[PDB]
Design a protein around this ligand. Structure first.
Ligand SMILES: Nc1ncnc2c1ncn2[C@@H]1O[C@H](COP(=O)(O)O)[C@@H](O)[C@H]1O
Ligand SMILES: Nc1ncnc2c1ncn2[C@@H]1O[C@H](COP(=O)(O)O)[C@@H](O)[C@H]1O
Lengths: 216, 216
């Protein structure tokens, strides 16, 4: 079950078997063994290659949304790693899985997000899209991705769901990085417009040690 | 059930309920409403947004691999749209889902593919990767993606599975484009080295009409 580590920011208790699976199976890589210049790149394939972990994520989130009232009407997953988790939840719930992608990967009439200006020498925000009408008015949308870091991607999702006239149920990630303070930042951004957005993480990055290091 | 439309090229019979679901729900877009310069862009979200179709794909492929002997040991899905289908199969079979990605999206020690030279004014082949050791020797690998067109992506998968010392069970796509002749080409390429690779399609593109056109 989920514990509140900050206002509207919940984390799966570390005694839960999914939490232990994720701590056990997550693998991360240094810049020399990874595609991105971050000190710990959490490799999503360390989760998808572990049938027990993948199944535990699926079971956990499916039971969560089945017993949630009102029930979610849509899952919106973020290109590309959100694609790995969303469909397996959505297929059990009997609801649409919708794709958040860069405009040049997405088809149809689109809606684009409006990211904030980048911070010091920092990391270019990505403009993301959904198809117009993919999310109807008074939809209730679960947003999903593998990792919540700064929250920039998450915020694009929030902006697109709100632009569609819909409600965000919550933002779920497998891994969350408290040190980057995404929930806290999104919760005060734009005058507190997103204060009531619930963030769920399944594992904290602080829990990962060099026992999780995949480096050769 | 599957019919042979060419040597080692099988297509789901059009009386099957999944075939009718796919014919009914698939949506395609012209260049002006799409991210790519092809006359019919098959929008994968037309499938993931249809819970009935997504579930039918899942049920069909899960039952297929459950009753297959020997059983597949791994599913390898192609970035990004293969990611939408693979995990929901793999999670039911209790086997790893492995990611085929461009090198600058993939983590760890990688293996890269070796595409053939491009054809007339034609379409740049993409070098694809898996992590070394993600697929063990005497693995039996199902390859999956949303669309089989020329077969270039598929061939990268074949080259990587064979380079790992593993067997390809088959290449599955939701949509297949007979006019581009991917199976026939892969089957004679490199002296017939891949003659015994089975291709499965769930719907032929010839079956899609302007009743499938998503354009506004
Ligand atoms: N440390 C990390 N390891 C792997 N992926 C990451 C990492 N940090 C961020 N990401 C990816 O970048 C996006 C989240 O970044 P952000 O927008 O800062 O919250 C997600 O789509 C993740 O896949
Ligand atoms: N007509 C199409 N509509 C949507 N996606 C396509 C289409 N043709 C090719 N693709 C994509 O390109 C890859 C297949 O192309 P190919 O390598 O030529 O077999 C797959 O990953 C598909 O997602």
């Amino acid at each position: 079950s989920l514990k509140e580590i900050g206002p509207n920011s919940l984390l799966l208790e570390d005694s839960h078997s999914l939490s232990q699976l994720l701590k056990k199976n997550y693998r991360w890589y240094s810049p020399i063994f990874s595609p991105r210049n971050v000190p710990r790149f959490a490799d999503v394939s360390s989760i998808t290659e572990s049938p027990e972990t993948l199944k535990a994520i699926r079971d956990f989130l499916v039971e969560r949304y089945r017993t949630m009232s009102p029930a979610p009407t849509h899952i919106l997953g973020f290109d590309a790693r959100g694609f790995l988790f969303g469909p397996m939840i959505a297929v059990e719930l009997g609801i649409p899985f919708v794709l958040m992608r860069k405009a040049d990967k997405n088809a149809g009439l689109l809606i684009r997000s409006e990211p904030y200006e980048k911070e010091y020498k920092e990391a270019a925000p990505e403009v993301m899209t959904i198809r117009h009408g993919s999310i109807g008015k008074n939809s209730r949308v679960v947003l999903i991705d593998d990792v919540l870091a700064t929250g920039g991607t998450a915020l694009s999702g929030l902006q697109l769901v709100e632009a569609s006239g819909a409600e965000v149920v919550e933002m779920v990630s497998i891994l969350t990085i408290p040190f980057l303070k995404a929930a806290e930042r999104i919760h005060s951004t734009a005058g507190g417009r997103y204060k009531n957005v619930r963030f769920i993480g399944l594992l904290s990055e602080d829990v990962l040690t060099e026992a999780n290091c995949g480096d050769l």
